[PDB]
Design a protein around this nucleic acid. Structure first.
Lengths: 44, 99, 67
RNA sequence: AGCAGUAAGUACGCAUUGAUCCCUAGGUCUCCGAAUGGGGAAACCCAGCUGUUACUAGCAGUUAUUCAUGAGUGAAUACAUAGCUCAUGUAAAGGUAACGCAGAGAACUGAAACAUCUAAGUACCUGCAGGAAGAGAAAGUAAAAACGAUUUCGUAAGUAGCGGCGAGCGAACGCGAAGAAGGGCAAACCAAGAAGCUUGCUUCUUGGGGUUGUAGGACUGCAACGUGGACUUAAGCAUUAUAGUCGAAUAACCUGGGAAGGUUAAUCAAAGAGGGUAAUAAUCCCGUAGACAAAAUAGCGCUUAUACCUAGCAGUAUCCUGAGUAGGGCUGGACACGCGAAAUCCAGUUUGAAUCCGGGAGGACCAUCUCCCAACCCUAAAUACUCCUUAGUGACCGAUAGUGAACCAGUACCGUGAGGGAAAGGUGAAAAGAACCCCGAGAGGGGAGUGAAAUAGCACCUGAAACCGUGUGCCUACAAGAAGUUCGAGCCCGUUAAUGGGUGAGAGCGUGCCUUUUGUAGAAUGAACCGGCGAGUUACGUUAUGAUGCGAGGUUAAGUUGA
RNA sequence: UAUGAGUAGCGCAAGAUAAGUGAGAAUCUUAUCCACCGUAAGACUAAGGUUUCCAGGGGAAGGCUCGUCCGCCCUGGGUUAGUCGGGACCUAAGGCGAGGCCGAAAGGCGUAGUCGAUGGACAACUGGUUGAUAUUCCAGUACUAGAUAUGAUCGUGAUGG
């Protein structure tokens, strides 16, 4: 039937935008894990 | 080396002892196209700049080991260089010293 | 040969930006119709692009920087 | 001496006049991002002010906040105050390899279960710091003469101890080595000021005073020692990174596609390290050993007066010497210490001294003795670890290895996300990459030619293995087998030259292999096959057995030296 | 790399002939009939998709078969606004939140304020136009708002009400 993601643009951001991830002193930490690994991109 | 140059011996390799003029070495290749030496031939298509092709007597480059610069009396060896004058003087050992 | 003359000659003298660089940071700072011959074609001669931008470049970064 | 990164790939060109390039310094530095004029989902939008220069423009800058410092303001409510405004100071927010410190802090385990313990105050998480951090100068240890801050290592030694005394955990002393530096302040006082100026003030500001254990300072005596210590300033010296430079020593023959290989000879010597070169080089090249070179470049070190605060000393008028402080109660915790005889230290909470005739420690505690002087602050050095910069080294490893990643790897790809996470290197020396000719819609082939070689032709060295084949000598279409032996009719062929091999009709007798089990042929498992990987170590300790050495004498650890 | 196995399936609906195309046509293109849907299987429009569009060329793979065809591939173009939707307006639900509050810390709360549309504010609509853009390009008509050029005159009249 219905599946999980049928997102819109607000949906694809607003959990994972750079200030959203940056905001709570925590997601920016795991982003810095994502930087200290340094994969294909950062914010998505 | 420093820019070749002159007639240049080929001791080892496919054509022993052959001397031949150089100017066109491009030392980044680290092996020098010399006229007469390492006779490549190319079967090129009848295309632009040769509408027959099939024959290109361009010649292969061979290594710095098989390049042997002689001083002008046909005497090779080891280039003692920079020794004498204002910027640089090239010569070989046991040689007539000219460049 | 050409470029050391036609580069080193120009504006190492200390006259100024709206003063001396009138030929470069004003006049040939119109990079139009040389670029604008770029991609219009019918030019056949390249080196003027980064040559001239190089000269206006050194005009700004020396002469329009030293004051 | 060519340049015109990657690399083909092109063009204008460019260049020993000195390019390209290397190094050093300066320049500009799109936007986002601590990200900060304001908002905002990352690559945005909209501004204000100041000049600019022109426009219903543009340019250039200023405009985040907190803190600190001033300046002004001035509510209830008179002063004030809060509050507000402006100005100044990256300060400072932030990114962070690893080590540290401090807080907060588990579980799983193991204890054959487990509630005590352990794991460990470790996993995590947060903060604070530097090149190291803490670390530290006895209110110490010890127990007799016994020394004299720390720190690291060895030792003591699993010794003393503690512990459902289970399981475990676990010292210190003293000694040995490295490293080896202590110095200020408050206090007391003295002088200045201002002031409770309520006078004699007894609080503040400045500068001396001096930092103490056998007490020491103040009071009476009275001496100028470089000092990271009594100034780790500035000026020269010297040399290193930071561009690199020179830099020795050989010829022929044979072979091959090619010599450095074989052969013949010769040289060199601070260079016979290593790597290339068509095939293994000392004498071909890079190099190598040595010997030179830097303006700027970041330093290190030496000399210089200066960059400043200290001494001894006898006596003792009284003061000082570190108050909610020691302590005491309770609750904790750490200390080997699990409340215990429990030391000793540090917490909360409560109570609360003495103060030099002092006070503390000496594992409850009371006396004698030993030592020390807390309750104020700083202290290099020896140590820990590397993202990093090279100089490098390998009984490292060779493309399933070695980093996940030798390859445009954290790539592709999965997942919304946090995350995860692949596969793959080799032609030939040199592309010299197969001109042409022919087949073929094209590809692809086939000739030619290429190259040492074309089974060498672009995922290309080498090429098994399973799979598919094509040919091949024998046999089988009256046969019901772990698919075998052994014998063997008959046929075919002639060999690591051998009492040859390939067969094989026929005929006798013959229950696959692994783990488990008492016993499996198995209808007990398991294995599609093929290839690759893929599993009993070492660290430290004990015991046993030998080997060797010396022997009631064996033995050096740590460390130092050194490649 | 087998095997099963040239077996299952070939992903819910009917095309047909002639002619072209090519080298090769069932499946490409046209013509001509048939057929189907038709409160849709039309057109237009959210989110989404992120260039898939169109033009030309080609057919290594892809297309579940073929394949000259193509959402496949190469190349090149293609999206146009004062009024259309948003922003330069306001604001809910909510989020962030200087101040402040408490808290080992991080934090979590929160006054002012700040954004936050699915809401409420407001001018343009007819005709033509490509391979493709149309309310956007232009003919005709506007209107909105501002500007500088120009006889006002005391007028504007606020965050207050």
């Amino acid at each position: 039937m219905k599946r999980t993601y049928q997102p819109h643009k607000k949906s694809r951001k607003t959990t994972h935008g750079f200030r959203s991830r940056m905001a709570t002193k925590n997601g920016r930490r795991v982003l810095a894990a994502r930087r200290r690994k340094g994969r294909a991109s950062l914010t998505v | 080396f420093v820019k070749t140059g002159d007639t240049v011996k080929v001791i080892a390799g496919k054509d022993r002892g052959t001397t031949g003029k150089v100017i066109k070495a491009l030392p980044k290749v680290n092996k020098v196209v010399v006229e007469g030496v390492a006779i490549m031939k190319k079967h090129q298509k009848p295309n632009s700049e040769n509408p027959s092709g099939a024959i290109l007597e361009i010649e292969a480059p061979i290594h710095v080991s098989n390049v042997q610069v002689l001083d002008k009396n046909g005497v090779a060896g080891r280039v003692g260089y920079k020794v004498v004058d204002d910027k640089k003087v090239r010569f070989n050992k046991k040689s007539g010293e000219i460049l | 040969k050409l470029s050391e003359t036609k580069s080193l000659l120009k504006d190492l003298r200390a006259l100024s930006v709206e003063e001396l660089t009138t030929r470069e940071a004003e006049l040939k700072k119109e990079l139009f119709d040389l670029r604008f011959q770029a991609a219009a074609g019918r030019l056949e001669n390249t080196a003027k692009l980064d040559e001239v931008k190089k000269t206006i470049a050194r005009v700004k970064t020396v002469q329009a920087e030293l004051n």
